[PDB]
C-alpha cells in the first residue's frame, strides 16, 4: 500500500540505514570457512579479527575458553540492539519492546521458582538474560515473598498484561513452572502478532509470516516432545497459539495425536512444513527436526531485508545475530572438544 515509503523515514530513516549496515557485518559463508579452518581457539580469535568481530577477547584471561566467547558474543549484539532501542521513538520502540519481552519472559520465570524456593533476588539477577534489565524496584528486595514479586510484576513489569492468564499466585504454586512460562509466552505471541497486524502495512506482510512460523513450529515440536511425558491433551492444546496456519484446522489433530507419525500426517497438509519433516532425516549422524526449523527461520529472517520500509528488519536482525552467535559458539565448542567432523552444523546466515 502507500502506507510505507512516506512517513517511515522521518523518524526511522536513520535506524533503517544503521540496522542494514549492521546486517552487512554478519559472517558470510566465506568467513565461516575461514573460522572452521582453525582447530585452535587462539587461531579462531585471529580469524575473527578479520571481520567486524574481534579485539573483544583482548585484556581477558590468558587462557581462552568457550564460555568467555559465548558471553562476549551476546554482549556485542546486546549493545548494538540497546543502542538502536535507545535511539528510537514510540512508533518503533513499542515494536522493539515485544522483542525484549521474549527475553524478559524467561527472566521473570527465573525470578519466580527461586522466589518460590526461597532464593534471594540478588542471587538470581546476575543470571538474567540482558535486555530484561528490570531497572525498577519492588521486583527487587521482595524479601523472598512470592506475593511481593507477584505485585511488583503486575505494577512495574511491562509483562503484567500477559500474566492475566496466570494469576492470584495460586497459579504460581500449583502450575508447573514450564506450563506457566509456556502460557505466558502464548499470551506474548498473541498480543505481539495482533500488534503487527495493527501496523497493517509492509511490516505486517513481512513480519507476520515469521511469527506464524514460530507458532506452528512450537505446536509441532510441543506435540512431539509431550508424547513421553505427563500432560493432558487438553492442557497441551491450551498452549497452542492461535496465530498461525494450523489454527483454522490442524491444531485439533496435533492435540489428539499420540505419535510422531500423526504429527507428520498433519504436516503433510502443509507443504511448507512437509518438506521440513522429510528433510529432517533424523539419522544417527544427520540433521534433525529442530535443525531444519532453524534453517527455515533464518531463510525468513533474511527475506525480511527485502523490504526497506518496515519494522520486520529489526526483529529479523536480532534473530539472525542470535543464530550467528549460536554458529560461532558451536565452532568454538567443536574446537575445544576437537569434534571436527561435526563442524559443519552451523546455520548459514548469508
Amino acid at each position: 500500500s502507500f502506507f510505507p515509503e512516506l512517513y517511515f523515514n522521518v523518524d526511522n530513516g536513520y535506524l533503517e540505514g544503521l540496522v542494514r549496515g549492521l546486517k552487512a557485518g554478519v559472517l558470510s559463508q566465506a568467513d565461516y570457512l575461514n573460522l572452521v579452518q582453525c582447530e585452535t581457539l587462539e587461531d579462531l580469535k585471529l580469524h575473527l579479527q578479520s571481520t567486524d568481530y574481534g579485539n573483544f577477547l583482548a585484556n581477558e584471561a590468558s587462557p581462552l575458553t568457550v564460555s568467555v566467547i559465548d558471553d562476549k558474543l551476546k554482549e556485542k549484539m546486546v549493545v548494538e540492539f540497546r543502542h538502536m532501542r535507545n535511539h528510537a521513538y514510540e512508533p518503533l520502540a513499542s515494536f522493539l519492546d515485544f522483542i525484549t519481552y521474549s527475553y524478559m519472559i524467561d527472566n521473570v520465570i527465573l525470578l519466580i521458582t527461586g522466589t518460590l524456593h526461597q532464593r534471594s533476588i540478588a542471587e538470581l539477577v546476575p543470571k538474567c538474560h540482558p535486555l530484561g534489565s528490570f531497572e525498577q524496584m519492588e521486583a527487587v528486595n521482595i524479601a523472598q515473598t512470592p506475593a511481593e514479586l507477584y505485585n511488583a510484576i503486575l505494577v512495574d513489569t511491562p509483562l503484567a498484561a500477559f500474566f492475566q492468564d496466570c494469576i492470584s499466585e495460586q497459579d504460581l504454586d500449583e502450575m508447573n513452572i514450564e506450563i506457566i512460562r509456556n502460557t505466558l509466552y502464548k499470551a506474548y505471541l498473541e498480543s505481539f502478532y495482533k500488534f503487527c497486524t495493527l501496523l497493517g502495512g509492509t511490516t505486517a506482510d513481512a513480519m507476520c509470516p515469521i511469527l506464524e512460523f514460530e507458532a506452528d513450529r512450537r505446536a509441532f515440536i510441543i506435540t512431539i516432545n509431550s508424547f513421553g511425558t505427563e500432560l493432558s491433551k487438553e492442557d497441551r492444546a491450551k498452549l497452542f497459539p492461535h496465530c498461525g496456519r494450523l489454527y483454522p484446522e490442524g491444531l485439533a489433530q496435533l492435540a489428539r495425536a499420540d505419535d510422531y507419525e500423526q504429527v507428520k500426517n498433519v504436516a503433510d497438509y502443509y507443504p511448507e512444513y512437509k518438506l521440513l519433516f522429510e528433510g529432517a532425516g533424523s539419522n544417527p549422524g544427520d540433521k534433525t527436526l529442530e535443525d531444519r526449523f532453524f534453517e527455515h527461520e533464518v531463510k525468513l529472517n533474511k527475506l525480511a531485508f527485502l523490504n526497506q520500509f518496515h519494522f520486520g528488519v529489526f526483529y529479523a536482525f536480532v534473530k539472525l545475530k542470535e543464530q550467528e552467535c549460536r554458529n560461532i559458539v558451536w565452532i568454538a565448542e567443536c574446537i575445544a572438544q576437537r569434534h571436527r567432523a561435526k563442524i559443519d552444523n552451523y546455520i548459514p546466515i548469508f
Binding site: 584471561a61 575458553t65 568457550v66 564460555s67 524456593h117 526461597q118 575445544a336 572438544q337
Partner: protein, 110 residues
C-alpha cells in the same frame, strides 16, 4: 534410598548430572552439589568437600580433575570408603590419567 551422589564441578558438569537424574535437596534445603565458577575460592570448595564427607547420606562424590588439584590435600588426607571420590575430565580439560589414585595404587597399570 540409601546414599546420594554429591557433585563438585563446573557449570556444564553439574548441569549434566542433574539432568542425569542425580542430586537433590536435603530436608534442610541444602543441595548435595557445588557449582565451581572462576570466582569460587579454595575455602568454599574445601569446606564443601569436608561437609559432604561429614554427611551420612552422601558418599560417592564426583569432582572435576582440575578441582581435585586445587584441593588435592583434602582428597589424599581422607582415606575411607564411603567417600569414594571419582575424578573426571571437564568439558575442556583433557582426559585424566596422571595422579590418579588408582593408577598410583596399582603399580601394574599404565
Amino acid at each position: 534410598r540409601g546414599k546420594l551422589i554429591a557433585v563438585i564441578g563446573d557449570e556444564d558438569t553439574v548441569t549434566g548430572f542433574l539432568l542425569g537424574g542425580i542430586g537433590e535437596l536435603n530436608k534442610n534445603r541444602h543441595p548435595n552439589f557445588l557449582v565451581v565458577e572462576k570466582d569460587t575460592t579454595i575455602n568454599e570448595i574445601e569446606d564443601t568437600f569436608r561437609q559432604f564427607l561429614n554427611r551420612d547420606d552422601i558418599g560417592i562424590i564426583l569432582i572435576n580433575q582440575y578441582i581435585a588439584e586445587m584441593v588435592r590435600h583434602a582428597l589424599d588426607a581422607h582415606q575411607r570408603s564411603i567417600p569414594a571420590v571419582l575424578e573426571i575430565p571437564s568439558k575442556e580439560h583433557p582426559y585424566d590419567a596422571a595422579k590418579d589414585s588408582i593408577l598410583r595404587r596399582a603399580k601394574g597399570m599404565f
